[PDB]
């Protein structure tokens with residue numbers, strides 16, 4: 448169990464003005480820290496944010512959060528469940544800003560909701576430095592789905608924050624799970640929703656990427672293959688080749704089981720395009736499966752690419768940041784259809 452702490456600075460809030468927070472389990476014999484960003488879409492105007500507040504309120508408010516959470520997957524402290532980082536200090540940061548962790552805007556007489564995702568991450572880091580993070584050697588910023596995209600948007604800002612605070616010895620790294628999307632043509636859109644969202648949230652993107660695409664085009668930096676080459680911190684990319692949320696935004700629904708030629712070609716092309724975008728990503732894990740998220744699911748140890756599991760690949764990554772014989776870090780499936788890899792989740 449990780450224990451809830453609400454932020455001491457109560458001006459850093461969830462959507463409805465309630466304090467943001469984090470869940471923490473310390474490991475006093477370790478100098479490694481894992482900060483995980485929760486996912487789950489986003490909302491981009493008053494009407495669809497109001498709907499989210501009715502039936503997804505834990506993603507907009509801390510009023511009903513429980514006092515504890517069990518750590519699972521990469522957040523588990525049992526070596527049987529987490530071969531990679533079982534002895535690390537564990538942090539779970541709930542997603543209550545609905546802004547893909549990009550926002551920097553308070554609730555006011557002009558704003559019904561606060562969108563403070565980018566500021567929530569910075570305040571969590573600040574308050575953790577007083578609880579042992581000041582002694583860390585590695586800070587791994589991880590996340591799934593919208594939290595995976597949030598890693599890409601925030602990892603270099605965390606590194607700059609710690610540099611300016613006088614901690615040049617902490618190595619900041621990123622782990623982005625299921626947050627590497629394509630702005631592709633639909634089978635029958637995220638780019639327009641994100642564009643409107645950034646204006647509604649006062650959203651912020653990494654500075655080098657912002658300077659490339661410039662004013663009005665910041666939405667480009669929410670797409671992994673465009674923002675990743677601008678980042679300085681090491682980032683490991685975990686991405687199913689046939690991600691269920693990618694297929695949803697593409698208006699694809701695999702149902703009833705009889706795929707005709709047009710849909711077959713569409714799905715095969717999506718796999719090939721996302722393989723292409725990862726070809727020059729040296730730390731990556733991309734299996735040919737139809738699924739969504741992996742790193743905090745308990746059976747995350749089961750899937751393999753070319754005979755190597757994800758916990759093994761992450762360990763090999765750690766070794767590379769001290770090629771390695773028999774301990775690979777770039778693992779991308781080549782077969783072209785979902786579940787052509789036998790280790791895919793059932």
Ligand SMILES: Nc1ccc(NCc2cccnc2)c(C(=O)O)c1
Nearest residue numbers: 486487488592593596628637692695
């Ligand atoms: N259905 C669905 C679709 C997208 C998701 N990610 C947000 C996102 C979308 C596009 C670009 N970047 C981030 C999620 C989730 O967070 O679980 C669920």
Ligand SMILES: *[C@@H]1O[C@H](CO)[C@@H](O)[C@H](O)[C@H]1NC(C)=O
Nearest residue numbers: 456457458459566567569570
């Ligand atoms: C609280 O957070 C806000 C928003 O980031 C910041 O402007 C303010 O300085 C913080 N207060 C303290 C005491 O750090």
